[PDB]
Amino acid sequence: ARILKTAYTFDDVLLVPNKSEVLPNEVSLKTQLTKKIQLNIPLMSASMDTVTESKMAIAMAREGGIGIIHKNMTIEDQAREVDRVKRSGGLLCGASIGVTNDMMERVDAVVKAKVDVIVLDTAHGHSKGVIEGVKRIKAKYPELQVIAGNIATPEAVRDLAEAGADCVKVGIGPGSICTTRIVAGVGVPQLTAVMDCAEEGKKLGIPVIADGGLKYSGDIVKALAAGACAAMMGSIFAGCEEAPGAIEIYQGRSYKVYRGMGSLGAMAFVPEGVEGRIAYKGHLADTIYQLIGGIKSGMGYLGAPTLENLYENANFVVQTSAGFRESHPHDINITKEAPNYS
Amino acid sequence: SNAMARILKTAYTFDDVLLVPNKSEVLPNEVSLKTQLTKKIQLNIPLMSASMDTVTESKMAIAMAREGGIGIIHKNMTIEDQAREVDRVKRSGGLLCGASIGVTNDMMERVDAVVKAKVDVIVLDTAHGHSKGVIEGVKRIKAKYPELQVIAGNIATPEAVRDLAEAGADCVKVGIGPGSICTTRIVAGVGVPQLTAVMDCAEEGKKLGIPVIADGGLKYSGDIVKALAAGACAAMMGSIFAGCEEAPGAIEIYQGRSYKVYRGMGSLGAMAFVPEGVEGRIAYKGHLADTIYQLIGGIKSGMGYLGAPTLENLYENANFVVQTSAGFRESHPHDINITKEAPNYSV
Amino acid sequence: NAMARILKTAYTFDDVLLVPNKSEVLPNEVSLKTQLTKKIQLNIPLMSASMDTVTESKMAIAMAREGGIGIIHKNMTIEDQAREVDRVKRSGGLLCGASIGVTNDMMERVDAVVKAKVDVIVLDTAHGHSKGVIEGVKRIKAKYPELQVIAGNIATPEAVRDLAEAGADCVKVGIGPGSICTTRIVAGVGVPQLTAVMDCAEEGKKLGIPVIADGGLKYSGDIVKALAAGACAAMMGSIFAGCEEAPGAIEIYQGRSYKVYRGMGSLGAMAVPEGVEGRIAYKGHLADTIYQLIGGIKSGMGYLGAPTLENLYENANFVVQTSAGFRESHPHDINITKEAPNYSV
Amino acid sequence: ARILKTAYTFDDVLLVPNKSEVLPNEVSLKTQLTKKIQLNIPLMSASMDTVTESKMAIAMAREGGIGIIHKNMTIEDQAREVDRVKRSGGLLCGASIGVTNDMMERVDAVVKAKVDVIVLDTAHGHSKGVIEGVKRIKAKYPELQVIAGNIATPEAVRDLAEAGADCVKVGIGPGSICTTRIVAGVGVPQLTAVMDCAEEGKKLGIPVIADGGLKYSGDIVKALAAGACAAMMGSIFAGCEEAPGAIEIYQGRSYKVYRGMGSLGAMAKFVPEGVEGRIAYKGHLADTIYQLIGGIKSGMGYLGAPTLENLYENANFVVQTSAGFRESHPHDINITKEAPNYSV
Numbered sequence A: 001a002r003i004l005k006t007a008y009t010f011d012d013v014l015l016v017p018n019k020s021e022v023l024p025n026e027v028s029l030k031t032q033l034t035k036k037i038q039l040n041i042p043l044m045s046a047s048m049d050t051v052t053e054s055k056m057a058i059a060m061a062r063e064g065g066i067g068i069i070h071k072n073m074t075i076e077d078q079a080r081e082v083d084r085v086k087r088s089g090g091l092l093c094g095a096s097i098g099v100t101n102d103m104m105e106r107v108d109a110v111v112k113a114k115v116d117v118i119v120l121d122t123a124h125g126h127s128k129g130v131i132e133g134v135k136r137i138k139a140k141y142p143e144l145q146v147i148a149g150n151i152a153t154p155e156a157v158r159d160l161a162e163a164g165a166d167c168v169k170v171g172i173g174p175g176s177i178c179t180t181r182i183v184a185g186v187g188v189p190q191l192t193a194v195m196d197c198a199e200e201g202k203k204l205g206i207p208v209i210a211d212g213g214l215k216y217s218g219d220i221v222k223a224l225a226a227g228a229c230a231a232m233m234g235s236i237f238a239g240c241e242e243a244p245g246a247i248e249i250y251q252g253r254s255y256k257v258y259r260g261m262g263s264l265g266a267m268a269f270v271p272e273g274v275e276g277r278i279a280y281k282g283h284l285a286d287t288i289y290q291l292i293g294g295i296k297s298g299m300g301y302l303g304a305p306t307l308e309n310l311y312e313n314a315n316f317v318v319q320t321s322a323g324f325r326e327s328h329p330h331d332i333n334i335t336k337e338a339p340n341y342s
Numbered sequence B: 001s002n003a004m005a006r007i008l009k010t011a012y013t014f015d016d017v018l019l020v021p022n023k024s025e026v027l028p029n030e031v032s033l034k035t036q037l038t039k040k041i042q043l044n045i046p047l048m049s050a051s052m053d054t055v056t057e058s059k060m061a062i063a064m065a066r067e068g069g070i071g072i073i074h075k076n077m078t079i080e081d082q083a084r085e086v087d088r089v090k091r092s093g094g095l096l097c098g099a100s101i102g103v104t105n106d107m108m109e110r111v112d113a114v115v116k117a118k119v120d121v122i123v124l125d126t127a128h129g130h131s132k133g134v135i136e137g138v139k140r141i142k143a144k145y146p147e148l149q150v151i152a153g154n155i156a157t158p159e160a161v162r163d164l165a166e167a168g169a170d171c172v173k174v175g176i177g178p179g180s181i182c183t184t185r186i187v188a189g190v191g192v193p194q195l196t197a198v199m200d201c202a203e204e205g206k207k208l209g210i211p212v213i214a215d216g217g218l219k220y221s222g223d224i225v226k227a228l229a230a231g232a233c234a235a236m237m238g239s240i241f242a243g244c245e246e247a248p249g250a251i252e253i254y255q256g257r258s259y260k261v262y263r264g265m266g267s268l269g270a271m272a273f274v275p276e277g278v279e280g281r282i283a284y285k286g287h288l289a290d291t292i293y294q295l296i297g298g299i300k301s302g303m304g305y306l307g308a309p310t311l312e313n314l315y316e317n318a319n320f321v322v323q324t325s326a327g328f329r330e331s332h333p334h335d336i337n338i339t340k341e342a343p344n345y346s347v
Numbered sequence C: 001n002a003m004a005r006i007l008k009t010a011y012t013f014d015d016v017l018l019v020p021n022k023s024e025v026l027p028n029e030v031s032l033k034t035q036l037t038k039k040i041q042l043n044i045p046l047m048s049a050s051m052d053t054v055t056e057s058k059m060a061i062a063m064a065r066e067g068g069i070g071i072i073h074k075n076m077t078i079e080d081q082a083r084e085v086d087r088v089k090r091s092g093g094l095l096c097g098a099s100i101g102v103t104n105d106m107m108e109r110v111d112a113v114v115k116a117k118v119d120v121i122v123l124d125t126a127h128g129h130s131k132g133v134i135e136g137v138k139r140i141k142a143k144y145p146e147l148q149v150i151a152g153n154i155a156t157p158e159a160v161r162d163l164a165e166a167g168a169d170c171v172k173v174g175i176g177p178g179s180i181c182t183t184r185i186v187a188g189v190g191v192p193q194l195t196a197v198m199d200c201a202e203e204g205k206k207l208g209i210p211v212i213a214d215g216g217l218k219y220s221g222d223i224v225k226a227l228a229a230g231a232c233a234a235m236m237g238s239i240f241a242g243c244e245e246a247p248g249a250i251e252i253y254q255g256r257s258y259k260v261y262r263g264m265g266s267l268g269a270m271a272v273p274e275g276v277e278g279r280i281a282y283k284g285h286l287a288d289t290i291y292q293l294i295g296g297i298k299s300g301m302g303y304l305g306a307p308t309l310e311n312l313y314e315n316a317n318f319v320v321q322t323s324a325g326f327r328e329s330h331p332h333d334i335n336i337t338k339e340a341p342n343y344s345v
Numbered sequence D: 001a002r003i004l005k006t007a008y009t010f011d012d013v014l015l016v017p018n019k020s021e022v023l024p025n026e027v028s029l030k031t032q033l034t035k036k037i038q039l040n041i042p043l044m045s046a047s048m049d050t051v052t053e054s055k056m057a058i059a060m061a062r063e064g065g066i067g068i069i070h071k072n073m074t075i076e077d078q079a080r081e082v083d084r085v086k087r088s089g090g091l092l093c094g095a096s097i098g099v100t101n102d103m104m105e106r107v108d109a110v111v112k113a114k115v116d117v118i119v120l121d122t123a124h125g126h127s128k129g130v131i132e133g134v135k136r137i138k139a140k141y142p143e144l145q146v147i148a149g150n151i152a153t154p155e156a157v158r159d160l161a162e163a164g165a166d167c168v169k170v171g172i173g174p175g176s177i178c179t180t181r182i183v184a185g186v187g188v189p190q191l192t193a194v195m196d197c198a199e200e201g202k203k204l205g206i207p208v209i210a211d212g213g214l215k216y217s218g219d220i221v222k223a224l225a226a227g228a229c230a231a232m233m234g235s236i237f238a239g240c241e242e243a244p245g246a247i248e249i250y251q252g253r254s255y256k257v258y259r260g261m262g263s264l265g266a267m268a269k270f271v272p273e274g275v276e277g278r279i280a281y282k283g284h285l286a287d288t289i290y291q292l293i294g295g296i297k298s299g300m301g302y303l304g305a306p307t308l309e310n311l312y313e314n315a316n317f318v319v320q321t322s323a324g325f326r327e328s329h330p331h332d333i334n335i336t337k338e339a340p341n342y343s344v
C-alpha cells in the first residue's frame, strides 16, 4: 500500500493563457471520436435513463455532438430508439451495451438498427468481463466502433486498446450523482485521470473521452486541454427539454429528475448513485450555445484555432481553495441571471 | 545557496485519499472477507463494534457475532456484570466475544472474571496504549494466561506496535483522536490522522507478524475499504453502530425523528473531570443486520474494483492517490437536490 | 510533440502573508510615490477601473486629486469619451487615462482622446497577449511616439516581453481575479493573481517596464501584497464602485444603501458573457475609502521597514498560509458588534 | 520578492504520541518566564483593557501564572494597579510600556510599585524604537526584567536579545480581535512563528512567549511543544469574571466586551488594526485555568514529558489537511451536553 501522488479535479486547476492570433468566433471544434467518427462539436450526452433516449440523441446530433442511448429498456426498444435516430436524416447515434448474458443479442439488434458506435459501459471497465466483451464484439463486427469504459488509469487504456477498443471512456466516481468513491473508496480525481489516460492513449493512437464531473463550460475546456477527444455530460443535459421525464413544478420553480444508473431507483441492493432533481433548463440548443461559446473563448485565450494544438499548448497551474474563491465571482450581490453562470 | 527547511510530514485521514482501480478478474460477489483478528481468532467479516457504553453490551455483541464480526463488551460496569454479559454471549451459541480491560488496581480481577466467562479476546483499552502501564499490563496478563488473546491500544506509531508486540500483545488497536465523539486532539493537541496512522502501524505490524485494528473515524463503507487496503486486519466502529436497535439506550423521538444517545467514554457523562469526549444524539438506524449488509456490500464493491479476492490481496495491491478539498467535493454527490433516501449514503 | 502539463501551484493574495522586517521607519514617514510609466509619476499607487460602473470624469477627477488616476471607460461614443477626458484635464491639470479597444475605429478614438490631452491610454482587452493588441500598440506608438500606452490584460512573463517589444510603456496584469469576473469559470483560463503579478513583475523589472496589479483586491493589505510582489500600481473596481463618485444612483433596499456594479463582459454592459451584474454597498465619498487604503499601505510598509515602494519590493518575503492560517489571519471567535472602517464581513 | 515556505498555525498540526512513563498527574508545569522569574504554570493574561487589571493579575498569579497590567490608563493608575497586586502577597505582576515620550516616567512609576517585569508592548517589536527603548530601560534599570514584542522572526529575536531583552513575545496577526494581517498584509502563522523564534531563542538563552491565536487547551500544548516558555491569551480570559467590564445579558445569554487594543474604541480612550465585540461570559478564572492545565497535563502524558523542557525536546509534529481537521474535531454527532473544555 503506497500513496502515489496528489491527483486533481477540474476545480483544482486553471489554464495559463497563451499568445493568440485567433478570435473565439474563428476557432474550430471538430474532433475525432474514433478514427472513423468525426463530431462537429466534442460533446456527448450520457447514457442514462434520465438523460438520453432518441429525443436527446437526435437533438445532440443536430447540434454536432452525439447521444448514447441507455440500455435500461428492452433490446427491442433500444434498437427501436437507435433506428428512430438513424432515420431522422443520417444523424450519428450511439447505444449502451452491458456485460450481460444477452450482450451479443443486444449488440446484434442495435447494429441491425445501424448504430454508429456502441459503448460497452460498466462501473469497472478495467475488468475481465469488459476485455473479453470487447474482443467478442470486434471478432464478430470488426468494423463496429466500440467505446469501452469506464476507466481511470493508463494501464486500463493499454489493456482495452489491446482488446480492440476504438476509444476509451474515463471516469470513476466524479459524476454529480455518483457515490462510488464514498461507498467503495475507489476512484481518481477526474482532471488527473483524463490527463494520465490521454497521455497513454496518444502513445497508442486511441482517443479518450472525459466522462463525468463537468459543471461549467470552462471545465470542458480543461478536459479537452488535458487531452480528451470529447466530453460526456449527464447533469448539464438532464434538465433540458429533450432529456426523459416530465417537468415538475414546486414553489414556482421547474425541475427534472436526475439519478445515477447505480441508484436504487434506476436498478429497480447496495447502490453507487443517488436520486434527485435538477433545475429545468429549457431547450438543449440554448445550453449547447453557452457551452460552445465558452469553449471557443477558452481556445481563443489559448491561441488554439483547432483542438489538436490545444493539448500540445496546454499549461495548467494548480490553485488553492483561496484561488478557487478568487476564480468565481466574489464580494458581489449578483442580482441578474447570467446564461452561463450560476 | 541551498537553504534549511523545516521537516514537517503531512499525515492523511480517509477523506484525504482514494483507491486507484486495478485490473479485476473478480466480481464483488466472489470475494472473501475472512480475516485473522489474531493468529488464533478468525472473523468472517472484518468488523468490530466499539467497547462503549452506548454501543456494545451483550445484545450488540451477539448480533455482531451472528453477522460474522465481533463486539467488545465495555467495562463501564461492575466486574460481575461484565462477566455476566460475556457469559450471555458465549451461551448464545458459541459466538465470539471480546471484553475491555483497563489499567486499574483491579485489572487482573476483571481479567479473571471474563476469562472464567470464556471471553475469546480481551482488549486492554486505554487512551494511550504506548505507555508503561499498558506494557506491564500486557506482560502480567500473558504471564498468567499465555493462551489468552490480548488486543492492546490505542496507539498511532510503529514504535508502539513494536513495543506492544514485544510485550506480548496478539494484536494492536490504532487510533488517537479520530473518533466522532472524541476531543483528544483538541484538548491535548495530540493525535495522528487515521489513514496514515493505520498505514504506518500496519506496515510495522506486517513485518513483525502482528495484526492491527483501525479504530475510529469511519463514516461510510468506503472508509473501511481504505482502512483495510492500508493493512488493517479489521475496522472498529462506534458511530456507525450506535444508532442500531441492538445498541444500548432507548429510542428517543423528537420532532418526527428517532434518535439514540452516543457519547465518548471520556465524556463527563460516561466518566460519571477534564474530559476528552462529548455526548450527543445520532439517527436511529434500525436493526444491525441492515447496516452490516450495506457495509459489506461496499467493501465487496471496493475489492471488485481492486481485483482483490481476499483482504490480503487487497492490501498487497492497493495504491492510493491524495485528493484536495475540491477533489473531495467531486467525490461526493454534487450539484443535485437529493430527494430519495439511499441506504448507504446520507448528507 | 509537446504534451499538456501542470506547471506549479499559483497563489492569490489570500494565500500569502508578508513577513515583518526590521523597521526604522514609522508608517507616517513612508513615501507612496510610484512611476506608472517612465514619464508618469503617481503620488499614491492606486487606479480606478475602466468600467461603466466605476470611472467617469467625476471619479477620475477625485482619484487624481487624491494622488492616483482614473481610466475613463470606452462604453460611450468617441466624442463623449473625449469630452470626459477634457473635463478632467480642465480641473487643474489632473492626470487622466482613457480606455481603447481593438476595434475598426481604434485610431479615431485614440485621436480624439489625444486631442483632449489624455495622459495615458490603456489598450484594454480580455486577452492582451494577442496579435491584435500587439499590432495595436505598434500602430499607436508609430503615430504617437510619446503617448504613454498601457496594454493588457496579461498573466505571463512571455506576454510582458511581447508587449514591451511592441512598445508598451506599462503592462496590466489580471486574467480572471475580478470580483465580477467569470472568465476562469466559463473559459477555464487564468492565473491566481499574486503569482501572476510576481512572475510578470519579475520579467518587467528585467526589461524596465512597470506592471499594474489589476483585479481581485478586497482589503488594503491585499494592495500591500501586490506592491510587495513588484506592481507599480493597483487597479480596483469593486473597492471604488460603491463610492459617491462612481457612476450610478444610490439605491435603497431594506435600510441598506447600494450601488450597481457589473463586469464589462456582462450581458448588461455589452448591451457569451464573462462577467456578472449585481450591487455592492454604498461607501460614501472616495476620500474616506482612500484614507483607509493609504493608512493600511503605510502600516504595511512600516512593518516591512520600507521607506519607499522600491525598497518594499526589494526586501519583501512572503510565506504561504493554509485555509487554517487564513481563519487565524481574520478575526475569529469574536462576535463583532461595532463597525471597523477598514474591515468588513 | 520571494515565497519562503508554507507557514502553519495551531490548527494545521498535531503532536505525535510518544512512549510515556509519566501520568498526567505526575508532570510539572513550572517554567522560566525569564532567567529570574519562574511561573508555576505557563500561562499569562493579555495586557488589554478588556482582559487584565489588578483583579485578573491577582487571580492569575494565585493560579501560578501572571497578568500584565495594560497601559490604557494614567501612569499613576497603572502604578496603583501593580501595587495592589504586589501587596496582595508578593504575587508576580507585569506592566505594559509603550514607545512614548513619557516611556521612562511610566517605567519609573511601575518600578516603584515593585513590578516584576515590564513588557515593551508594540505592534511591531522589530523596530528601532523598541530596540532603543529596551537599551534605555536596561541602562537605567539593569536588573529590571524586560519582555519586548511583538515579533515573528528569528532576526527579531536576535536584535531584541542584543538590545538586552530578557524575553521576547511572538505574535504578529494571530489575535482573535486582530486585523493586522488583513489591513497591512503582514504576519506569520503562529505555530511556525513560535517554532522559528523559540528555536532562535534557545540558541541565545532567551525565552519566547506564544502570544495570541489560542482557542483550546490543545493549542497551548502545541505552543509549548514548539518551544515557547509561556502562552499568553486574551480571548480565553476576557469572559472571566475577573476580567474588566460588566456582564451583559442579550437574549438569555451572558457576555463580556472584548476588543483589540488597536481598535477604534480602545484607541479613542485613524486606521485601526483590531475589532470590538463580545464573547461569552465564562464565570470564574479558576474554572478556566483548571481545564487549560488539565488539557496541558494530558498532552504531556501523551508525549511522555515530565517537564516542559522534555516536552519540547521530544515533540514531533505532523501536518493535517482540512479533512484531517474535520476528523480531529467531533464530527457526525449532534452534541446535546455542554462540555467544559470544548465548544464550537
Ligand SMILES: C=C(C)c1cccc(C(C)(C)NC(=O)Nc2ccc(Cl)c(N[C@@H]3O[C@H](CO)[C@H](O)[C@H]3O)c2)c1
Pocket: A099, A122, A123, A124, A125, A127, A128, A129, A130, A180, A261, A262, A263, A270, A271, A272, A273, B024, B026, B027, B028, B301, B302, B304, B305
Ligand atoms: C457507474 C456505476 C458506478 C454503476 C452503474 C450501474 C450499476 C452500478 C452498481 C451499483 C450495480 N455497481 C456496480 O456494478 N459495482 C461494481 C463494482 C466493482 C466491480 Cl468489479 C463491478 N463489476 C461489474 O461487472 C462487470 C464485469 O465486466 C463490470 O466490470 C462491472 O459493471 C461492479 C454502478
Ligand SMILES: C=C(C)c1cccc(C(C)(C)NC(=O)Nc2ccc(Cl)c(N[C@@H]3O[C@H](CO)[C@H](O)[C@H]3O)c2)c1
Pocket: B103, B126, B127, B128, B129, B131, B132, B133, B134, B184, B265, B266, B267, B274, B275, B276, B277, D020, D022, D023, D024, D298, D299, D301, D302
Ligand atoms: C479514549 C479516550 C481518549 C478516553 C477514554 C476514557 C477516559 C479518557 C480520559 C478523559 C480519562 N482521558 C485520559 O485518560 N487521558 C490520558 C491522557 C494521557 C495519558 Cl498518559 C493517559 N494515561 C492513562 O493512564 C493509563 C496508563 O497506562 C493509560 O495509558 C491512560 O488511560 C490518559 C479518555
Ligand SMILES: C=C(C)c1cccc(C(C)(C)NC(=O)Nc2ccc(Cl)c(N[C@@H]3O[C@H](CO)[C@H](O)[C@H]3O)c2)c1
Pocket: A020, A022, A023, A024, A297, A298, A300, A301, C102, C124, C125, C126, C127, C128, C130, C131, C132, C133, C183, C264, C265, C266, C272, C273, C274, C275
Ligand atoms: C475583461 C473581460 C474578460 C471582458 C471585458 C469585456 C468583454 C468581454 C467579453 C465578454 C466580450 N469576452 C471576450 O472578449 N473574450 C475573449 C476571449 C478570448 C479572446 Cl482571444 C478574446 N479576444 C478579444 O479580441 C481582442 C484581440 O486582441 C483581444 O484579444 C480580446 O479583447 C476575447 C470580456
Ligand SMILES: C=C(C)c1cccc(C(C)(C)NC(=O)Nc2ccc(Cl)c(N[C@@H]3O[C@H](CO)[C@H](O)[C@H]3O)c2)c1
Pocket: C023, C025, C026, C027, C299, C300, C302, C303, D099, D121, D122, D123, D124, D125, D127, D128, D129, D130, D180, D261, D262, D263, D271, D272, D273, D274
Ligand atoms: C497590536 C496591535 C497591532 C496594535 C495595538 C494598538 C494600536 C495599534 C495601531 C492600530 C495603532 N497600529 C499600529 O501601531 N501599527 C503599526 C504598524 C507599523 C509600525 Cl512600524 C508601527 N510602529 C509603531 O510605533 C512604534 C515604533 O517602535 C512601534 O514599533 C509600533 O507600535 C505600528 C496596533
Ligand SMILES: O=c1[nH]cnc2c1ncn2[C@@H]1O[C@H](COP(=O)(O)O)[C@@H](O)[C@H]1O
Pocket: A046, A047, A048, A150, A171, A173, A174, A175, A176, A177, A178, A179, A180, A211, A212, A213, A214, A232, A233, A234, A235, A236, A259, A260, A261, A262, A263, A272, A273, A274
Ligand atoms: O449511479 C452511478 N454511479 C456512478 N457513476 C454514474 C452513475 N450513473 C451514471 N454515472 C456516470 O456519471 C456520468 C455523469 O456525470 P455528470 O455529468 O457529472 O452528471 C455518466 O456519464 C456516467 O459515467
Ligand SMILES: O=c1[nH]cnc2c1ncn2[C@@H]1O[C@H](COP(=O)(O)O)[C@@H](O)[C@H]1O
Pocket: B050, B051, B052, B154, B175, B177, B178, B179, B180, B181, B182, B183, B184, B215, B216, B217, B218, B236, B237, B238, B239, B240, B263, B264, B265, B266, B267, B276, B277, B278
Ligand atoms: O471519549 C472518547 N475520547 C476519545 N476517543 C474515544 C472516546 N470514547 C471512545 N473513543 C474511541 O473512539 C472510537 C469510536 O469512534 P467512531 O467510530 O468514529 O465513533 C472508539 O472505538 C474508541 O477508540
Ligand SMILES: O=c1[nH]cnc2c1ncn2[C@@H]1O[C@H](COP(=O)(O)O)[C@@H](O)[C@H]1O
Pocket: C049, C050, C051, C153, C174, C176, C177, C178, C179, C180, C181, C182, C183, C214, C215, C216, C217, C235, C236, C237, C238, C239, C262, C263, C264, C265, C266, C274, C275, C276
Ligand atoms: O466582465 C468582466 N470579466 C472579467 N474581468 C472583468 C470584467 N469587467 C472588468 N473586469 C476586470 O476586473 C477588474 C476589477 O476587479 P475588482 O477590483 O476585483 O472588482 C477590472 O479592472 C478589469 O480588469
Ligand SMILES: O=c1[nH]cnc2c1ncn2[C@@H]1O[C@H](COP(=O)(O)O)[C@@H](O)[C@H]1O
Pocket: D046, D047, D048, D150, D171, D173, D174, D175, D176, D177, D178, D179, D180, D211, D212, D213, D214, D232, D233, D234, D235, D236, D259, D260, D261, D262, D263, D273, D274, D275
Ligand atoms: O487590536 C489589536 N490588533 C492586533 N493584535 C492585538 C490587538 N489587541 C491585542 N492584540 C494582540 O492579541 C493578543 C490576544 O489574542 P487572542 O488571545 O487570540 O485573543 C494580545 O495578547 C495581543 O498580542
